[PDB]
């Protein structure tokens, strides 16, 4: 049987695993985390994360789909919270069959952990890797005591994440022709109870989004009601007293900050203070490999290959649509050198597509008659004219179609919109026949 080791417990590679081991292969994954399946006194802090059709249809392949989305919440469309005005909900599709699920992150590891163990893999918990002897094929791994242990592997998955020690080591014998995209807005994951989301009326089946130009807030469902909320803000001032996180000392400055800016949004976070102070602000950067492997010994899959920032909601499904990919490369190929180098090709374009338009989703939430004109054309031409966060969502086309497609829309609609300042002024009908004409269905 051919054997593979695999670094990190995630979501990428808890399923490559199960994909792995369900094919015959003897899979050996080490997680430097304790097992989350094992309860403890602690507390369960976890975001939740929207499962578009492209990561639910890997799960489907694995055959674990049903089983996840029995305990995801559906999300029908974005809810647009501007103080004053009722909330706008755009919907994501025609009808519920075109939707988006938020499932809980520790839900997911833990139905993956249970997969990849029924399909024979063995999970190793509280070991982190520290170090690779790509020449000897061995790898050095330690708990946080520090106590070390050496294994020796045939082949190395590195899905350890977007700090991934598999690439650190890789970038030791290969250069990775390395890009490194830092942003300047960080992140503070906040939380909405059950009680208060209820008490004013927050739409459970919606993701919800405070615009606020340079800083922004959005919040996901939970089963019990409760959201995630994640604020995203500038790491400095400019050189000067604009908002940011250096400016925001303690909690009590954030209420302060949430009191004016968003303060809708405030009366919801009754922890908003210490969970400003007690979790860390995240940073956001795009991260872009040339290459992927090294010969037939390691490769890179998930956020260890292509970080990238958050927006758009694509990170785990990605992931996931790696994971399936090359599981298939090397299920097939002639020998793990080719897999490796197969499954770069393949899937290295379509995560620059998506770290790309990532970053654009980034940009245009930090004009108006664009959006509502391509409104428009999207419901007259269906098949023809979708709209980016829906192609993106709602179909496993490739990243890099999605993101051409985008291009030729946004350009169809500056050509309608130039040198008009309203719509009535507008050759619809003209529109129309331009996507039919650039647009195959
Ligand atoms: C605020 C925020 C919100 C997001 N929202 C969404 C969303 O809504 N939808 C979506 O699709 N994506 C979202 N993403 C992106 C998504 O979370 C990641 O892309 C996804 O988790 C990548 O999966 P992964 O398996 O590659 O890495 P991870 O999920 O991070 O798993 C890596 C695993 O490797 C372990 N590990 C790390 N280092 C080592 C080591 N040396 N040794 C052993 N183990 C190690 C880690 O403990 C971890 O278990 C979001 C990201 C952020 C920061
Ligand atoms: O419809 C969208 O544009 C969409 C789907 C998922 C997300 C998402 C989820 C989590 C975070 Cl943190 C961010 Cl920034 C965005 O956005």
């Given at each position: 049987a051919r054997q593979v080791t695999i670094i990190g417990a995630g979501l990428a590679g808890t399923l490559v695993a199960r994909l792995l081991a369900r094919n015959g292969w003897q899979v050996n994954l080490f997680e430097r985390r304790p097992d989350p399946r094992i309860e403890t006194g602690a507390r369960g802090r976890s975001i939740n994360l929207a499962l578009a059709e492209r990561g639910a249809h890997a799960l489907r392949l694995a055959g674990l789909e049903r089983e996840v989305l029995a305990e995801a919440v559906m999300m029908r469309g974005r809810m647009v919270h501007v103080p004053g005005t009722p909330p706008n909900l755009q919907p994501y599709g025609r009808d519920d069959s075109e939707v988006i699920w938020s499932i809980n992150?520790?839900?997911?590891?833990?139905?993956?952990?249970?997969?990849?163990?029924?399909?024979?893999?063995?999970?190793?918990?509280?070991?982190?890797?520290?170090?690779?002897?790509?020449?000897?094929?061995?790898?050095?791994?330690?708990?946080?005591?520090?106590?070390?242990?050496?294994?020796?592997?045939?082949?190395?998955?590195?899905?350890?994440?977007?700090?991934?020690?598999?690439?650190?080591?890789?970038?030791?014998?290969?250069?990775?022709?390395?890009?490194?995209?830092?942003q300047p807005h960080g992140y503070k994951e906040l939380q909405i109870t059950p009680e208060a989301s209820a008490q004013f009326n927050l739409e459970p089946n919606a993701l919800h989004i405070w615009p606020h130009g340079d800083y922004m807030c959005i919040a996901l469902p939970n089963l019990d009601r409760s959201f995630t909320v994640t604020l995203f803000l500038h790491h400095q001032s400019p050189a000067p007293a604009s908002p940011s996180f250096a400016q925001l000392v303690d909690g009590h400055a954030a209420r302060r900050f949430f009191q004016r800016q968003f303060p809708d949004l405030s009366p919801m976070l009754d922890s908003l203070e210490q969970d400003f102070e007690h979790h860390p602000t995240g940073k956001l950067a795009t991260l872009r490999l040339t290459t992927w492997h090294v010969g037939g010994q390691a490769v890179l899959l998930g956020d260890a290959a292509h970080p990238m920032v958050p927006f758009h909601g694509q990170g785990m499904n990605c992931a996931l649509e790696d994971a399936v990919a090359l599981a298939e490369h090397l299920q097939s190929a002639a020998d793990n050198a080719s897999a490796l180098a197969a499954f770069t090709a393949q899937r290295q374009p379509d995560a620059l597509a998506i770290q790309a338009m990532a970053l654009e989703n980034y940009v245009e939430m930090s004009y108006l008659l664009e959006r509502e004109l391509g409104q428009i054309m999207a419901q007259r031409q269906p098949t023809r004219f979708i709209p980016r966060y829906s192609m993106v969502t709602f179909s496993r086309l490739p990243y890099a179609q999605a993101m051409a497609r985008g291009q030729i829309q946004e350009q169809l609609l500056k050509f309608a919109v130039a040198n008009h300042s309203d719509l009535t002024s507008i050759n619809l009908d003209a529109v129309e026949h331009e996507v039919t004409r650039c647009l195959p269905p």
């Open positions: 992150r520790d839900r997911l590891n833990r139905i993956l952990l249970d997969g990849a163990e029924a399909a024979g893999a063995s999970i190793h918990f509280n070991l982190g890797l520290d170090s690779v002897d790509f020449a000897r094929q061995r790898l050095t791994l330690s708990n946080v005591s520090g106590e070390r242990l050496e294994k020796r592997f045939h082949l190395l998955i590195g899905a350890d994440g977007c700090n991934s020690a598999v690439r650190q080591a890789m970038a030791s014998v290969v250069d990775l022709g390395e890009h490194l995209e830092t």
